[PDB]
mmCIF file of C-alpha atoms and ligand atoms in Angstrom:
data_model
loop_
_atom_site.group_PDB
_atom_site.id
_atom_site.type_symbol
_atom_site.label_atom_id
_atom_site.label_comp_id
_atom_site.label_asym_id
_atom_site.label_seq_id
_atom_site.Cartn_x
_atom_site.Cartn_y
_atom_site.Cartn_z
ATOM 1 C CA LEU R 1 -15.515 -17.088 39.271
ATOM 2 C CA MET R 2 -17.792 -15.204 37.332
ATOM 3 C CA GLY R 3 -14.331 -14.262 35.069
ATOM 4 C CA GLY R 4 -12.482 -11.328 35.153
ATOM 5 C CA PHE R 5 -9.928 -9.843 37.604
ATOM 6 C CA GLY R 6 -9.566 -9.942 41.427
ATOM 7 C CA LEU R 7 -8.404 -6.945 43.501
ATOM 8 C CA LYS R 8 -7.805 -5.777 46.885
ATOM 9 C CA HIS R 9 -8.804 -2.390 45.995
ATOM 10 C CA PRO R 10 -10.793 -2.407 42.995
ATOM 11 C CA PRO R 11 -12.559 0.664 41.410
ATOM 12 C CA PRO R 12 -14.087 2.649 44.020
ATOM 13 C CA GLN R 13 -17.883 2.702 43.961
ATOM 14 C CA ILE R 14 -19.235 6.058 42.715
ATOM 15 C CA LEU R 15 -22.736 7.028 44.103
ATOM 16 C CA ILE R 16 -24.941 10.167 42.715
ATOM 17 C CA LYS R 17 -28.081 11.266 44.070
ATOM 18 C CA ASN R 18 -30.367 14.092 43.496
ATOM 19 C CA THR R 19 -30.919 16.415 46.574
ATOM 20 C CA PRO R 20 -33.738 16.192 47.968
ATOM 21 C CA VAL R 21 -35.805 20.476 47.616
ATOM 22 C CA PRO R 22 -38.606 20.379 49.643
ATOM 23 C CA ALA R 23 -41.929 21.625 47.668
ATOM 24 C CA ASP R 24 -43.608 24.991 50.504
ATOM 25 C CA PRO R 25 -43.661 23.725 53.626
ATOM 26 C CA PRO R 26 -45.838 24.678 56.529
ATOM 27 C CA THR R 27 -46.186 28.591 57.938
ATOM 28 C CA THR R 28 -46.136 27.225 60.975
ATOM 29 C CA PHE R 29 -43.546 25.173 62.557
ATOM 30 C CA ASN R 30 -43.416 21.247 63.195
ATOM 31 C CA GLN R 31 -41.109 18.874 64.281
ATOM 32 C CA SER R 32 -41.959 16.292 61.367
ATOM 33 C CA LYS R 33 -39.139 15.881 58.623
ATOM 34 C CA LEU R 34 -40.375 17.152 55.198
ATOM 35 C CA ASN R 35 -42.093 14.650 53.195
ATOM 36 C CA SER R 36 -43.294 16.976 50.253
ATOM 37 C CA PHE R 37 -40.776 17.653 47.721
ATOM 38 C CA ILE R 38 -40.609 18.864 44.306
ATOM 39 C CA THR R 39 -40.815 16.516 41.349
ATOM 40 C CA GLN R 40 -37.460 16.176 39.899
ATOM 41 C CA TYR R 41 -34.662 14.558 37.877
ATOM 42 C CA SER R 42 -31.288 14.585 36.641
ATOM 43 C CA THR R 43 -29.690 13.726 33.532
ATOM 44 C CA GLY R 44 -25.701 14.409 31.916
ATOM 45 C CA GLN R 45 -22.946 12.379 30.510
ATOM 46 C CA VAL R 46 -20.310 10.298 31.950
ATOM 47 C CA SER R 47 -17.112 9.647 30.789
ATOM 48 C CA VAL R 48 -14.609 6.194 31.645
ATOM 49 C CA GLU R 49 -10.995 6.297 30.220
ATOM 50 C CA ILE R 50 -9.119 2.984 30.705
ATOM 51 C CA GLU R 51 -5.617 2.422 29.781
ATOM 52 C CA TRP R 52 -4.827 -1.462 29.384
ATOM 53 C CA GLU R 53 -1.652 -3.286 29.134
ATOM 54 C CA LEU R 54 -0.889 -6.014 26.129
ATOM 55 C CA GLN R 55 1.109 -8.832 26.319
ATOM 56 C CA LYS R 56 2.286 -9.346 23.033
ATOM 57 C CA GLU R 57 2.095 -12.870 21.134
ATOM 58 C CA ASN R 58 5.484 -14.828 20.175
ATOM 59 C CA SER R 59 4.665 -17.715 18.873
ATOM 60 C CA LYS R 60 6.412 -20.012 16.798
ATOM 61 C CA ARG R 61 4.000 -21.908 14.929
ATOM 62 C CA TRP R 62 3.728 -22.328 11.504
ATOM 63 C CA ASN R 63 0.597 -22.589 10.394
ATOM 64 C CA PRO R 64 -2.579 -19.943 10.610
ATOM 65 C CA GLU R 65 -4.359 -19.774 14.019
ATOM 66 C CA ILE R 66 -7.670 -19.590 14.697
ATOM 67 C CA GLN R 67 -9.082 -16.001 14.664
ATOM 68 C CA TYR R 68 -12.561 -14.404 15.824
ATOM 69 C CA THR R 69 -14.068 -13.589 11.772
ATOM 70 C CA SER R 70 -17.358 -11.545 10.750
ATOM 71 C CA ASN R 71 -19.773 -13.919 8.622
ATOM 72 C CA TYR R 72 -18.933 -14.039 4.867
ATOM 73 C CA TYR R 73 -22.214 -14.415 3.281
ATOM 74 C CA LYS R 74 -25.420 -12.074 3.091
ATOM 75 C CA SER R 75 -27.671 -11.497 6.208
ATOM 76 C CA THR R 76 -30.814 -9.585 7.204
ATOM 77 C CA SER R 77 -29.019 -7.465 9.047
ATOM 78 C CA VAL R 78 -25.044 -6.248 10.277
ATOM 79 C CA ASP R 79 -23.996 -8.631 13.602
ATOM 80 C CA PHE R 80 -23.281 -6.378 16.351
ATOM 81 C CA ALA R 81 -25.363 -3.155 14.785
ATOM 82 C CA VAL R 82 -28.414 -1.422 15.045
ATOM 83 C CA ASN R 83 -32.283 -2.433 13.924
ATOM 84 C CA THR R 84 -34.587 -1.166 10.805
ATOM 85 C CA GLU R 85 -35.898 -0.035 15.035
ATOM 86 C CA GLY R 86 -32.743 1.441 16.235
ATOM 87 C CA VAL R 87 -32.119 -1.303 18.585
ATOM 88 C CA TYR R 88 -28.184 -2.429 18.688
ATOM 89 C CA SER R 89 -28.039 -5.940 19.562
ATOM 90 C CA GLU R 90 -24.704 -8.507 20.117
ATOM 91 C CA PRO R 91 -25.887 -12.006 18.067
ATOM 92 C CA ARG R 92 -23.397 -14.084 20.315
ATOM 93 C CA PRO R 93 -20.782 -14.106 23.284
ATOM 94 C CA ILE R 94 -17.413 -13.358 22.417
ATOM 95 C CA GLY R 95 -14.407 -14.976 24.380
ATOM 96 C CA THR R 96 -10.832 -14.195 24.439
ATOM 97 C CA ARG R 97 -8.683 -17.593 23.356
ATOM 98 C CA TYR R 98 -8.213 -17.528 19.681
ATOM 99 C CA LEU R 99 -4.645 -17.475 19.646
ATOM 100 C CA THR R 100 -2.919 -20.751 20.933
ATOM 101 C CA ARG R 101 -0.002 -21.271 23.364
ATOM 102 C CA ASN R 102 2.052 -24.206 24.555
ATOM 103 C CA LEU R 103 1.984 -25.659 28.183
ATOM 104 C CA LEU M 1 -1.035 -8.121 -13.773
ATOM 105 C CA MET M 2 -0.044 -11.001 -11.902
ATOM 106 C CA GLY M 3 -0.634 -9.048 -8.788
ATOM 107 C CA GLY M 4 2.359 -7.532 -6.763
ATOM 108 C CA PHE M 5 4.602 -4.437 -6.837
ATOM 109 C CA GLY M 6 5.939 -3.503 -10.316
ATOM 110 C CA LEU M 7 9.892 -1.958 -9.868
ATOM 111 C CA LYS M 8 11.718 0.128 -12.360
ATOM 112 C CA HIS M 9 14.927 -1.206 -10.274
ATOM 113 C CA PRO M 10 13.402 -4.857 -8.771
ATOM 114 C CA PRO M 11 15.907 -7.309 -6.738
ATOM 115 C CA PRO M 12 18.985 -7.961 -8.843
ATOM 116 C CA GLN M 13 19.161 -11.251 -10.626
ATOM 117 C CA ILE M 14 21.405 -13.641 -8.892
ATOM 118 C CA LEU M 15 23.289 -15.812 -11.035
ATOM 119 C CA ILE M 16 25.306 -19.022 -10.160
ATOM 120 C CA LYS M 17 27.320 -21.470 -11.707
ATOM 121 C CA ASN M 18 29.877 -24.596 -10.927
ATOM 122 C CA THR M 19 33.178 -23.563 -12.271
ATOM 123 C CA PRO M 20 33.841 -26.322 -14.905
ATOM 124 C CA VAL M 21 36.755 -28.373 -14.040
ATOM 125 C CA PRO M 22 38.693 -30.520 -16.843
ATOM 126 C CA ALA M 23 39.066 -33.881 -16.472
ATOM 127 C CA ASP M 24 42.538 -34.732 -17.434
ATOM 128 C CA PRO M 25 43.367 -33.233 -20.925
ATOM 129 C CA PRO M 26 45.440 -34.871 -23.647
ATOM 130 C CA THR M 27 49.175 -35.041 -23.140
ATOM 131 C CA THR M 28 50.042 -33.608 -27.328
ATOM 132 C CA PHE M 29 48.508 -30.187 -27.986
ATOM 133 C CA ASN M 30 44.912 -29.750 -29.606
ATOM 134 C CA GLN M 31 43.128 -26.342 -30.452
ATOM 135 C CA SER M 32 39.522 -27.987 -29.365
ATOM 136 C CA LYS M 33 37.909 -27.136 -26.471
ATOM 137 C CA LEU M 34 37.989 -29.028 -23.861
ATOM 138 C CA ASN M 35 34.641 -30.747 -23.310
ATOM 139 C CA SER M 36 35.679 -33.639 -20.957
ATOM 140 C CA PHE M 37 34.824 -32.502 -16.991
ATOM 141 C CA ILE M 38 34.974 -33.793 -13.809
ATOM 142 C CA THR M 39 31.737 -34.795 -13.034
ATOM 143 C CA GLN M 40 30.142 -32.394 -9.329
ATOM 144 C CA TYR M 41 27.041 -30.025 -8.078
ATOM 145 C CA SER M 42 27.853 -28.119 -5.549
ATOM 146 C CA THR M 43 25.260 -27.194 -2.544
ATOM 147 C CA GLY M 44 25.133 -25.025 0.507
ATOM 148 C CA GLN M 45 22.710 -22.340 1.985
ATOM 149 C CA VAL M 46 20.941 -18.993 1.451
ATOM 150 C CA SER M 47 19.679 -16.501 2.941
ATOM 151 C CA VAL M 48 17.210 -13.913 2.280
ATOM 152 C CA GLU M 49 16.013 -10.870 5.021
ATOM 153 C CA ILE M 50 13.120 -8.568 3.789
ATOM 154 C CA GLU M 51 12.053 -5.226 5.666
ATOM 155 C CA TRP M 52 8.505 -4.450 5.085
ATOM 156 C CA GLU M 53 7.021 -1.345 5.937
ATOM 157 C CA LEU M 54 3.280 -1.411 7.443
ATOM 158 C CA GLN M 55 0.189 0.851 7.179
ATOM 159 C CA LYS M 56 -1.540 0.207 10.316
ATOM 160 C CA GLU M 57 -5.805 -0.186 10.279
ATOM 161 C CA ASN M 58 -7.354 3.462 11.763
ATOM 162 C CA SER M 59 -11.179 1.970 11.301
ATOM 163 C CA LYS M 60 -13.915 3.446 13.091
ATOM 164 C CA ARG M 61 -15.816 -0.160 12.306
ATOM 165 C CA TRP M 62 -18.190 -0.543 14.905
ATOM 166 C CA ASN M 63 -18.778 -4.152 14.011
ATOM 167 C CA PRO M 64 -16.031 -7.047 13.879
ATOM 168 C CA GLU M 65 -14.353 -7.538 10.518
ATOM 169 C CA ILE M 66 -13.676 -10.588 8.558
ATOM 170 C CA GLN M 67 -10.642 -11.858 9.290
ATOM 171 C CA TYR M 68 -8.751 -15.181 8.091
ATOM 172 C CA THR M 69 -9.125 -17.919 10.174
ATOM 173 C CA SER M 70 -8.159 -21.966 10.859
ATOM 174 C CA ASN M 71 -10.462 -24.111 11.067
ATOM 175 C CA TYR M 72 -11.908 -24.944 14.309
ATOM 176 C CA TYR M 73 -13.507 -28.698 14.075
ATOM 177 C CA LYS M 74 -11.405 -32.394 13.924
ATOM 178 C CA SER M 75 -9.328 -32.975 10.812
ATOM 179 C CA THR M 76 -7.296 -35.765 9.453
ATOM 180 C CA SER M 77 -4.207 -33.264 9.196
ATOM 181 C CA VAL M 78 -3.438 -29.920 10.158
ATOM 182 C CA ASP M 79 -3.747 -27.036 7.318
ATOM 183 C CA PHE M 80 -0.523 -25.850 5.912
ATOM 184 C CA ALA M 81 1.523 -28.286 8.081
ATOM 185 C CA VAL M 82 3.429 -32.013 7.260
ATOM 186 C CA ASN M 83 2.459 -34.870 5.841
ATOM 187 C CA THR M 84 2.557 -38.378 7.861
ATOM 188 C CA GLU M 85 5.199 -38.519 4.586
ATOM 189 C CA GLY M 86 6.824 -35.336 5.630
ATOM 190 C CA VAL M 87 5.704 -33.436 2.456
ATOM 191 C CA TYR M 88 4.258 -29.999 3.342
ATOM 192 C CA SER M 89 1.098 -28.302 1.586
ATOM 193 C CA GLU M 90 -0.690 -25.463 0.895
ATOM 194 C CA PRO M 91 -4.237 -26.301 1.746
ATOM 195 C CA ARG M 92 -5.667 -23.533 -0.079
ATOM 196 C CA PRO M 93 -4.935 -19.542 -1.743
ATOM 197 C CA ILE M 94 -4.752 -17.224 0.961
ATOM 198 C CA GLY M 95 -5.462 -13.512 -0.090
ATOM 199 C CA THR M 96 -4.595 -10.396 1.701
ATOM 200 C CA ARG M 97 -7.995 -8.462 1.714
ATOM 201 C CA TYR M 98 -10.044 -9.298 5.366
ATOM 202 C CA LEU M 99 -9.998 -5.748 6.978
ATOM 203 C CA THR M 100 -12.312 -3.124 5.025
ATOM 204 C CA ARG M 101 -12.199 0.582 4.545
ATOM 205 C CA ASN M 102 -14.631 3.109 3.135
ATOM 206 C CA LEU M 103 -14.242 4.370 -0.503
HETATM 207 NA NA1 LIG N 201 -18.855 -10.580 13.814
HETATM 208 NA NA1 LIG N 202 -5.362 -22.587 8.500
#
């Protein structure tokens, strides 16, 4: 309902975790689980490549269609670009239904 | 200068003409060229097929481009369609420069 493709076997969940690294333990044995760990975090890159199949348009509509377009006249900033502060932003929601089709 | 492609050997001129058909001539010989012809005209269909090579766009521009689009809101008629009188019309001139390219 929120939109999209419903899949019985969707892309799998990808779980990740930093392995706990004990800080020095006591010198004489104790049953209790360790609760003192070295403070750490991780970082790295991640890549996702997806192949999409397109269904080309085959319309005999004579007149031009509606199309998503960038604004023409001057503006303080560029839509879908960064700030003077380096902040990226999406000015508006962009749908998918521009071309038309008969029923 | 009016725009377009300059060709040393452009598509050839295609000339057409209805052959003159004499109306009855005099019964005794006369030097003069005939000047009395049967009234006629011709009609038929004509076809032109042209193959065009396209140079696809290869831009890394992140933000959307400007695009020619049909108007969104209601209107008395449809742009680039016929009249209630069956008259076709081109509401505006449509150029060719929407996508962008670096220098
Ligand atoms: Na835009
Ligand atoms: Na239009």
